[PDB]
């Protein structure tokens, strides 16, 4: 039995949606978030936008998670019925072999397994070197291209990992596919939920962007549609609390609070906004951790470059095994991220946003 929160997280992570194929996820997020929004719309690529007005002419605050999860796409059916695919999102070859996947065809779902050449047929050296993704295939038990086509398989079909939502013996730890970034979508939902019963001097947009995993694409189009004054990118961060990792390599720990990202490859955090958020956490007694993502980015990267620019900050959840069939995250970090963003939004009136944005006067002009 799962409570209201876990039920929602399970529904979100259960949804299937890779870049350019996010509809099912959008439908689930929409059902959960509309009760807390005055208006729900989408951009032309499919990003879900839920608007909640707290103050008619108040500043616009964008909270962005992303609907897409990393996956694969059918590209070819061999003469013998095997499926060739293309990775859509960043995948590490070493977590793919012998994994169960689901191909979503026009005729329904088809279960398959990712495979390669048997080890004994490879050279002792090649047996130690990682198999190349381009040399992998998916087996669905077909014996010819004709048969696979008859079953409904076609180039372009979405292929998604299959994994059952699992609550660990310590119920705070949750194992599931796509925490990246259904957890961010969840954060946007629950923040709007909190705003239904508390005043906020602004207009808040809970957003589920599309195609973040292929280049922060939906974030660009969604932000253009919204024209936000402030933005918070919510996503997952890499946890460094597993065997073999030193603090120098990854300092964050699950359960120690949401991560305040000071820097990532797509954006240098806005100091004014960053300081405002940190101050709020301290005042509210909310735990948090600082971190940086040298080789990664978040939707904030695209959002902050919209029009005249947008002061923004990324807040993430330290997660283990990102971009694999089963990631693990801590419920307290999730709940505290929601509380932190809610408390910050309550302070973001026009005056505060103007001063955070224009630091040399005439800010209210
Ligand atoms: Zn992400």
Superfamily of domain 1-72+163-365: Zn peptidases (3.40.630.10)
Q: Residue 260 Cα, ligand 1 centroid: separation in angstroms? A: 15
Torsion of CA 192, 217, 12, 64, to 10 degrees: -20
- CB contact at 8 A, 25 and 185: yes
- Please give the span between the terminal C-alpha atoms of the chain, in angstroms, as a whole number: 54
- The residues near 202 (Cβ < 8 Å, ≥ 6 apart) are 54, 55, 58, 59, 60, 61, 345, 348, 349, 350, 353
Structure tokens at 184: 């961010």
Q: Which residue numbers belong to the known binding site for a divalent metal cation?
A: 66, 180, 213, 235, 323
- CB contact at 8 A, 21 and 187: no
Structure tokens at 203: 């207009």
Q: How far is CA 111 from CA 153, 326, 350, in A?
A: 11, 18, 52
CA 46, chain centre distance (Å): 15
Which residue has tokens 């490879």? 122
Q: Which fold has domain 75-162?
A: Elongation Factor Tu (Ef-tu); domain 3 (2.40.30)
Which alpha helices (DSSP H) does the chain contain, by range?
Answer: 4-14, 23-33, 145-150, 179-195, 217-226, 271-284, 300-303, 331-347, 350-357
Give the torsion sign (CA, 164, 48, 308, 361): negative
- Catalytic, 212? Answer yes
Nearest-angstrom CA–CA distance, 230 and 232? 7
Q: Residue 247 Cα, ligand 1 centroid: separation in angstroms? A: 22
Protein residues near ligand 1, an ion, with CB under 5 A = 180-181, 235
Give domain limits for the chain: 1-72+163-365, 75-162
- Please spell the DSSP secondary structure of 35-86, one letter per residue: GG-SEEEE-TT--EEEEEESSTTSPEEEEEEE----EEEEEEE-TTS-EEEE
Q: Residue 365 Cα, ligand 1 centroid: separation in angstroms? A: 36
- CB contact at 8 A, 237 and 318: yes
Q: Is 285 left (phi over 0), alpha (psi -120 to 50) or beta?
A: left
| DSSP tag of 229 | S
Q: Residue 297 Cα, ligand 1 centroid: separation in angstroms? A: 8
Number of H helices and E strands in the chain, helices first, is: 9, 18
Bridge partner residues of 353 (DSSP): none
- CB contact at 8 A, 179 and 317: yes
Quick count: other Cβ atoms within 10 Å of Cβ 233? 33
Which of 174, 166, 213, 183 lies closest to 71 in space, CA to CA?
213
Which of 182, 197, 229, 193 lies closest to 334 in space, CA to CA?
182
Q: What value does the CA radius of gyration of the chain take, rounded to a whole number of Å? A: 21
Nearest-angstrom CA–CA distance, 100 and 83? 13
Which residue has tokens 């002061």? 311
Which experimental approach was used here? X-ray
Catalytic residue among 212, 247, 282, 283: 212
Q: What is the resolution of this structure in A?
A: 1.9
């Amino acid at each position: 039995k799962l409570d209201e929160t876990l039920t929602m997280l399970k529904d979100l992570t259960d949804a299937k949606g890779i870049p350019g194929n996010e509809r099912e996820v959008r439908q689930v997020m929409k059902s959960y978030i509309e009760p807390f929004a005055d208006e729900v719309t989408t951009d032309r690529l499919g990003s879900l936008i839920a608007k909640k007005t707290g103050a008619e002419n108040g500043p616009k605050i964008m909270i962005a998670g992303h609907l897409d999860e990393v996956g694969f796409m059918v590209t070819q059916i061999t003469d013998k019925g095997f499926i060739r695919f293309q990775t859509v999102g960043g995948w590490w070859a070493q977590v793919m072999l012998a994994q169960r996947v689901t191909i979503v065809t026009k005729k329904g779902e088809i279960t398959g397994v990712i495979g390669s050449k048997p080890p004994h047929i490879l050279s002792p050296e090649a047996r130690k070197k990682s198999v190349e993704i381009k040399d992998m295939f998916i087996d669905i038990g077909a014996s010819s291209r004709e048969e696979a086509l008859e079953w409904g398989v076609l180039p372009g079909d979405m292929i998604v990992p299959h994994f059952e939502f699992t609550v660990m013996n310590n119920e705070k730890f949750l194992l599931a596919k796509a925490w990246d970034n259904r957890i961010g979508c969840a954060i946007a939902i629950d923040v709007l939920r909190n705003l239904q019963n508390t005043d906020h001097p602004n207009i808040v947009y809970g957003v589920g962007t599309v195609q973040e995993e292929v280049g922060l694409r939906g974030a660009k189009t969604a932000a253009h549609t919204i024209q936000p004054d402030i933005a918070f990118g919510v996503d997952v961060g890499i946890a460094g609390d597993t065997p073999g990792i030193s603090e120098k390599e990854a300092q964050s720990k699950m359960g120690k609070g949401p991560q305040i990202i000071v820097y990532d490859a797509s954006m240098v955090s806005h100091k004014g906004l960053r300081d405002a958020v940190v101050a709020t956490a301290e005042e509210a007694g909310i735990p948090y951790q600082f971190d940086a993502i040298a080789g990664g980015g978040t939707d904030s990267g695209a959002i902050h470059l919209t029009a005249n620019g947008v002061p923004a900050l990324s807040i993430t959840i330290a997660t283990r095994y990102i971009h694999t069939h089963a990631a693990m995250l801590h419920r307290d970090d999730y709940e505290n991220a929601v509380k932190l963003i809610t408390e910050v939004i309550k302070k973001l009136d026009r005056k505060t946003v103007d001063e955070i944005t224009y630091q040399e006067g005439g800010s209210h002009h």
